[PDB]
Design a binder for this molecule. Structure first.
Ligand SMILES: [Zn+2]
Lengths: 93, 93, 1110, 195, 48
């Protein structure tokens, strides 16, 4: 038993990097997108860990289905600009 | 912040109160699918879930349900590390 | 002279050797040959004076058979073991990772008593591991050695002790069998003779005598000499044999009710039936010798007999009374004395053959039990040996012993000497032996009987001191397991050519004279009195006519390693032990050279270790390459020898054989044709001979530290090659098989630049820490990626790949070139373990140069680590410009009592620079006894100084005073052995002359390269959650209890708290502290280490109500 | 001697009924883990083996009483249950210790914290710690009384987090992952920050 | 040599709504179980 390492123990450095990724992502790119951040947050669920389908936004708010997808596509295209797509390009691993 | 540590003689009532469920099977894990067997040793319903907020049948698999007991398998959805603090008892004739 | 090669090495020996050194591997090979049984063994046994010899396997099989079932109606038997041929060869087994064994066949005969049938035929008993020519066992591709075990031989042992209350002398005797109940008699302080049977309560022996069938008249007739016997008899309340039998049965077996037949047959089966009580073959002989029974007849029945019990009682009674001699009726006269169990006349040696025989016996017992179970379960007509014979238990026992027994050990392959000494190791531990925690001073101390059998020097330094030793050079093992040593028969004060092998108890009855005693050409002793050893091992002067035996050689007492310490007699026992132990740790160097000064053993040992290649038959060399040597024998036969090249040893040391012969060169049988790892021209070369100056230098050699010149690094003098193997396996999983692939998720294209197309690293590449060796991937299954990772993948359009990387990566701190790759794939045979589809081995070799922290040592126990390596211009240099290679501190020698190294240095300087003794005015007085060959020798001439017979004080002084000059016709070293050096740094000459010469320095296998690891964060334990230990993992250093005491003494409350909580097992604290350090913040407060919580919830178990209040 | 024991129950609020057990507790599984070793092999603490036996016997008794077995068999089963519980709490105390494969006795609960090994003297009073290393020592005569020579690699490993912080804040690495990657490969910029 | 055994933003303000049941055993021991609003409460339960 003294040679079997625990494979579920929290790795310190990793546990740090993640909270930095969650800090450098939620702050900058989210804020420069104004209210277009909200749709992204619900789409991937990074605000409460609850991914939501398109209709789950339209069930309450007046936005329509295809418009949400268009907004998502535009945000996806413009957030991949190197000036703002290079700082987050080191956390892929 | 501890004041004192008191030792005593545990009674049947104390042992029963410590427990979250009676163990009544010697099974530990099934041979195929390598998962804990119900009502035996390593039982999830007694000692808690193996994964974080994931019950046996998978009906509840997200943090939002924290504290809810699954009505289909009885496994509470909580941290997987509760398995090192949940006790069980054997009622011997 | 024995070796045709025989490199020239003049010797200072003045005594001619009357007996040649025997084979040093005989202890293993002869025992194994006895076990299996071989034609040469049969011939040797016949010649030795025995008829109808029986091997170990035959003995065990005869013991097992015949067998009849309960309520006998039919019988079975085994006989005639046979070995046909080994399945594979040595190196095939070594490479393919399979045991080197041969099949075994035994003829089994099944007989039906009702009809008289015979179902006789051969049965396959399994694969018996076989011994190689070197005396090793290849198990699962690994070479292993079975070490002989020292064990107290079975017999009857008497002793006496002074009581505490009454202070009377109380005598006791114990009968120790191979198997059976323990029987021991005693005399009480009340003057009564009792007996404890099968560890039961004491009672008078008279009841035992009565139960055995003795009326109350024969006891008086026989034991009428003593008075305690009559006291016991009169005090005995029991009357008649029947009365005693009932009491004995009640006491021994109080559970079941007494009966008549059971009571009558109780003692019969307890001791007198071989199936339940058996003295070994040695036990019967020892009992007969002690009590003088069965004098002059073969020993076939070994079980106890009724005569010997009364003989033992009489012996004990007479010994207590005070009689010196004693003779039982029908027996010869024997003396009366107590037994010291440390005497080798009592301690015997279990060789490898006997150790294997015991396991074979156990396996056959289990097989016989299974046969008994199956015998009465099927029909009696269509029943054959195959149906009811299960060979699994015996093969299982054989496999268990080799892979699990403590005696079967992983061979030490640092160098040939290490392996040779391993095979001659005598161990007191192991099953049936001593325990390291239950061994007092008496057992581990040197006993006089050891002389010539067990070396008093070679032994472990640590807690195993005295429990593990080495066999002496000339020692031989008696078939009973006792160690015999040779002596020269001397009669009428004239040494005779006859040689006899004697045992300790046998030599105790003789007077033995030391070999180094003056003798005339005729053989008659020159002196009037001679030095001898007496019965008690006491040393005395006696008249020349009183000696009846003589030592064979002066070095009869030393082992193989101890025999290679020059000037041993000038070194203290502790330092000699340290040097002998160190000799076995020398690592092979890239190039080897024999010492200038040594013993004559280096040669023979090198051949006996079996690492050098010797021509089998006389002939002429035909072809010589770096890989093979082809020799055309004198007749038409021709033989090819394969040379091992860059083969990893058991301890990751390069084993490299190279030829020394040339094409068209005549060679003779037994002549070395290729050198081994640590050999040079057929001799043993463990280190390097180099120039040394004895002086303190600026405090860099303070407290045993050593300074080396940079030359040894530039010229690779102390460089060594180290090879390591890395293994990876691709197997099956419930989620799908894992594949060896060249593409790995999330890896830079540059990283996998040296990977072969299959994903394996390319040969000749230079891998460093963290580099990929073999590419592997395993299925993931569930993903449940985090929202942040999902968004990151979406913005980059990266697939959630099915497989995770599990490639084999170079361990931390490793480096070197890739030299070899081995691949096994289940598709192409490759009988891998179930579930494994691919197996890849990669060999990485690196060349290590001597550096700071590496451990060097001499042959006299003068170990030390290198503290400083200077450039050549800084080292002190001789007045001719020659710089020294090593500086050793002067404060070590005198207090450590290893002055032999100074003589080594002087004689090494003499050897390197030739010498010539002027003989114009006759011969000098000091050189009177030197042999002619030592009168003059050229430069770089090697010399031999055998231990206890070698270069003398005055001879060494004269040779120092009569050396040849250098190229400029001048002498650097004066007649006192000192020279005037120059300071390399300042440049001025040192004020006083310094001792300078040549020393043999060898590189031990203790290198800082492989012991440096540090840790900041790594794997943790499953339960306690504390860091793991060991360099294999990212081991954390243990902060032991004593360190806590020290911290408390300092009053460092905070440091201790952080050590015990934050840095060990405060799970939350660990990650929070890492985050704080990375972010540059104050360290958070610790709390509640996990170990205490585990303790609390462990005490909660086993019903203890432990709780915390506030 | 008898009063020494009797007074404990007299002058307290606890009764001696605790010496007879009606329900044995069970330790959480994590403290007796069933870890899947590499290659699919399973390693299990023998403690959970003992428990199993108890349960088995405790079940058999429940059956024997149910169908009204003769008193001899019921008494034998009760004795077996007693022995199993005894060995669970303290193996080898009364009779021959319970053994599994080979002949090594099983490790009971008491053994887990009894002697030199266990928890008290092996995991509570002294333990292995992070941020630590070890190496051979050599004499430094040029050092001052308050100075020691630390190998470059050992110092780098010990100070890895500090080195990573000083690399990221000095713009040698863009983030913590980059700093760690740089430190692992030991690029030249690392040694400047290390000193 | 290594083995294996069989990290989300914690939040206390927001949680899935739940309803508490109530069960009696043969011995009169009361137990409570928090179930989700989906209900589907079984008629019989296994208590501690
Ligand atoms: Zn469920």
């Amino acid at each position: 038993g003294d040679f079997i390492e625990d494979s579920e123990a929290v790795v310190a450095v990793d546990a740090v990097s993640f909270t930095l990724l969650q800090d450098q992502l939620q702050s900058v790119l989210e804020t420069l997108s104004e209210r277009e951040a909200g749709v992204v947050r619900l789409r991937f669920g990074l605000t409460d860990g609850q991914p939501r389908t398109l209709d789950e936004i339209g069930q309450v708010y007046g936005v329509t289905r295809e418009r949400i997808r268009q907004i998502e596509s535009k945000t996806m295209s413009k957030l991949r600009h190197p000036s703002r797509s290079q700082v987050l390009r080191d956390y892929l691993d | 912040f501890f004041d004192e540590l008191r030792i005593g003689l545990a009674t049947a009532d104390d042992i029963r109160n410590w427990s979250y469920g009676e163990v009544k099977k010697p099974e530990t894990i099934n041979y195929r699918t390598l998962k804990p067997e119900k009502d035996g040793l390593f039982c999830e319903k007694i000692f808690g879930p193996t994964r974080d907020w994931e019950c046996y049948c998978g009906k509840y698999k997200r943090v939002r349900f924290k504290g809810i007991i699954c009505e289909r398998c009885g496994v509470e959805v909580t941290r997987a590390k509760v398995r090192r603090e949940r006790m069980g008892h054997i009622e011997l004739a | 002279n024995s070796v045709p090669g025989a490199p020239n090495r003049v010797s200072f020996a003045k005594l001619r050797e009357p007996l040649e050194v025997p084979g040093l591997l005989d202890v293993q090979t002869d025992s194994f040959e006895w076990l299996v049984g071989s034609d040469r063994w049969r011939q040797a046994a016949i010649d030795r004076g025995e008829e109808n010899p029986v091997g170990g396997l035959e003995e065990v099989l005869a013991e097992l058979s015949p067998i009849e079932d309960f309520s006998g109606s039919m019988s079975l038997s085994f006989s005639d073991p046979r070995f046909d041929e080994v399945k594979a060869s040595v190196d095939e087994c070594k490479d393919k990772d399979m045991t080197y064994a041969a099949p075994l066949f035994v003829t089994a005969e099944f007989i039906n008593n009702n009809t008289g049938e015979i179902k006789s035929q051969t049965v396959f008993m399994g694969d018996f591991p076989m011994m190689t020519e070197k005396g090793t066992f290849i198990i699962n591709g690994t070479e292993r050695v079975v070490v002989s075990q020292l064990v107290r031989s079975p017999g009857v042992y008497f002793d006496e002790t002074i009581d505490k209350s009454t202070e009377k002398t109380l005598h006791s005797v114990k009968v120790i069998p191979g198997r059976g109940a323990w029987l021991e008699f005693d005399v009480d302080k009340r003057d009564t003779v009792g007996v404890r049977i099968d560890r039961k309560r004491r009672q008078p022996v008279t009841v035992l005598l009565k139960a055995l069938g003795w009326t109350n008249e024969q006891i008086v007739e026989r034991f009428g000499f003593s008075e305690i016997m009559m006291g016991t008899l009169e005090k005995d309340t029991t009357s008649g044999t029947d009365e005693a039998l009932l009491d004995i049965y009640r006491k021994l077996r109080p559970g079941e009710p007494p009966t008549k037949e059971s009571a009558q047959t109780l003692l019969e089966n307890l001791f007198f039936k071989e199936k339940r009580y058996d003295l070994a073959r040695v036990g019967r002989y020892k009992v007969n010798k002690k009590l003088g029974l069965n004098a002059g007849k073969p020993i076939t029945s070994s079980t106890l007999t009724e005569e010997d019990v009364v003989a033992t009682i009489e012996y004990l009674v007479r010994l207590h009374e005070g009689q010196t001699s004693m003779t039982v009726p029908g027996g010869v006269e024997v003396p009366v004395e107590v037994d010291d169990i440390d005497h080798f006349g009592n301690r015997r040696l279990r060789t490898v053959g006997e150790l294997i025989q015991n396991q074979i016996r156990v396996g056959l017992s289990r097989m016989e039990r299974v046969v008994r179970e199956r015998m009465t379960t099927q029909d009696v007509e269509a029943i054959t040996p195959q149906t009811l014979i299960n060979i699994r238990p015996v093969v299982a026992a054989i496999k268990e012993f080799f892979g699990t027994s403590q005696l079967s050990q992983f061979m030490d392959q640092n160098n040939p000497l290490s392996g040779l000494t391993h095979k001659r190791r005598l161990s007191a531990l192991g099953p049936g032996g001593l325990s390291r925690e239950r061994a007092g001073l008496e057992v581990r101390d040197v006993h006089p009987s050891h002389y010539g059998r067990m070396c008093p020097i070679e032994t472990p330094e640590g807690p195993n001191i005295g429990l593990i030793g080495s066999l002496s050079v000339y020692a031989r093992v008696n078939p009973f397991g006792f160690i015999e040593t040779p002596y020269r028969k001397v009669e009428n004060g004239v040494v005779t050519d006859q040689i006899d092998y004697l045992t300790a108890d046998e030599e105790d009855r003789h007077v033995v004279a030391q070999a180094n005693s003056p003798t005339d050409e005729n053989g008659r002793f020159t002196e009037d009195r001679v030095m001898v050893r007496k019965k008690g091992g006491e040393v005395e002067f006696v008249s020349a006519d009183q000696v009846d035996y003589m030592d064979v050689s002066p070095r009869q007492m030393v082992s193989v390693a101890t025999a290679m310490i020059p000037f041993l007699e000038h070194d203290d026992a502790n330092r000699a032990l340290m040097g002998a132990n160190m000799q076995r740790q020398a690592v092979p160097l890239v190039r080897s050279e024999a010492p200038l000064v040594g013993t004559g053993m280096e040669l023979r040992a090198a051949i006996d270790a079996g690492d050098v290649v010797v021509a089998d038959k006389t002939g002429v060399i035909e072809e010589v390459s770096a890989d093979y040597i082809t020799v055309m024998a004198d007749d038409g036969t021709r033989q090819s020898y394969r040379l091992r090249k860059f083969a990893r040893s058991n301890h990751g040391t390069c084993a490299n054989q190279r030829p020394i012969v040339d094409a068209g060169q005549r060679v003779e049988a037994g002549q070395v044709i290729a050198d081994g790892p640590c050999t040079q021209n057929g001799e043993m070369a463990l280190g390097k001979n180099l120039l040394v100056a004895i002086m303190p230098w600026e405090g860099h050699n303070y407290e045993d530290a050593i300074i080396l010149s940079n030359r040894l690094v530039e010229e690779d003098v102390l460089t060594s090659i180290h090879i390591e193997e890395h293994e990876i396996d691709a197997r099956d999983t419930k989620l799908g098989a894992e594949e060896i692939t060249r593409d790995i998720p999330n890896v830079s294209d540059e990283v996998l630049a040296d990977l072969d197309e299959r994903g394996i690293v390319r040969i000749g590449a230079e891998v460093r820490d963290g580099d990929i060796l073999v590419g592997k991937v395993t299925p993931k299954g569930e993903t449940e990626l985090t929202p942040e990772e999902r968004l990151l993948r979406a913005i980059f359009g990266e697939k959630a790949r099915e497989v995770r990387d599990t490639s084999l990566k170079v361990p931390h701190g490793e480096s070197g070139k890739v030299i070899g790759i081995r691949v096994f794939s289940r598709e192409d045979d490759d009988e891998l373990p179930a579930g494994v589809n691919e197996l890849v081995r990669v060999y990485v070799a690196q060349k290590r140069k001597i550096s700071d922290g590496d451990k060097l040592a001499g042959r006299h126990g003068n170990k030390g680590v290198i503290g400083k390596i200077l450039p050549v211009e800084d080292m002190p240099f001789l007045p001719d410009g020659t710089p020294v290679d090593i500086i050793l501190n002067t404060h070590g020698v005198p207090r450590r009592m290893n002055i032999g190294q100074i003589l080594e240095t002087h004689l090494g300087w003499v050897a390197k620079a030739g010498w010539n003794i002027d003989v114009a005015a006759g011969v000098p007085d000091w050189a009177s006894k030197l042999p002619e060959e030592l009168y003059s020798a050229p430069a770089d001439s090697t010399v031999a100084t055998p231990v206890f017979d070698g270069a003398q004080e005055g001879e060494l002084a004269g040779l120092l005073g009569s050396t040849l000059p250098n190229r400029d016709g001048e002498v650097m070293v004066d007649a006192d052995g000192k020279s005037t050096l120059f300071d390399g740094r300042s440049g001025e000459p040192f004020p006083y002359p310094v001792t300078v010469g040549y020393m043999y320095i060898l590189k031990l296998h203790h290198l800082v390269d492989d012991k440096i690891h540090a840790r900041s964060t790594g794997p943790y334990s499953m339960i306690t959650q504390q860091p793991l230990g060991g360099k294999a993992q990212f081991g954390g250093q243990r902060f032991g209890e004593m360190e806590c005491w020290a911290m408390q003494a300092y009053g460092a409350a905070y440091t201790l708290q952080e050590l015990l909580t934050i840095k060990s097992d405060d799970t939350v604290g660990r990650v929070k502290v890492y985050e704080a350090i990375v972010k540059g913040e104050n360290i958070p407060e610790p709390g509640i280490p996990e170990s205490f919580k585990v303790l609390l919830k462990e005490l909660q178990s086993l019903c203890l109500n432990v709780e915390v209040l506030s | 001697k008898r009063l020494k024991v009797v007074a404990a129950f007299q002058q307290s609020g606890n009764s001696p009924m605790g010496m007879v057990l009606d329900a044995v507790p069970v330790i959480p599984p994590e403290l007796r883990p069933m870890v899947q070793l590499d290659g699919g092999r399973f390693a299990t603490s023998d403690l959970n083996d003992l428990y199993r036996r108890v349960i088995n016997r405790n079940n058999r008794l429940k059956r024997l009483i149910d169908l009204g077995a003769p008193e001899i068999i019921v008494n034998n089963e009760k004795r077996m249950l007693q022995e199993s519980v005894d060995a669970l709490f303290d193996n080898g105390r009364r009779g021959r210790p319970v053994t599994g494969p080979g002949n090594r006795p099983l490790k009971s609960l008491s053994d887990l914290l009894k002697g030199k090994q266990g928890r008290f003297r092996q995991n509570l009073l002294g333990k292995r710690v992070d941020y630590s290393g070890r190496s051979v020592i050599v004499v430094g005569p040029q050092l001052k009384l308050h100075q020691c020579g630390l190998p470059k690699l050992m110092a780098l490993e010990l100070f890895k987090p500090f080195v990573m912080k000083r690399l990221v804040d000095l713009n040698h690495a863009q983030n913590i992952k980059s700093a760690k990657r740089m430190v692992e490969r030991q690029r030249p910029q690392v040694w400047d920050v290390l000193e | 040599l290594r083995g294996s055994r069989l990290y989300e933003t914690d939040r206390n303000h927001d949680l899935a709504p739940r309803q508490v049941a109530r069960y009696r055993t043969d011995n009169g021991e009361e137990f409570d179980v928090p179930f989700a609003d989906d209900a589907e409460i079984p008629g019989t339960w296994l208590c501690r």
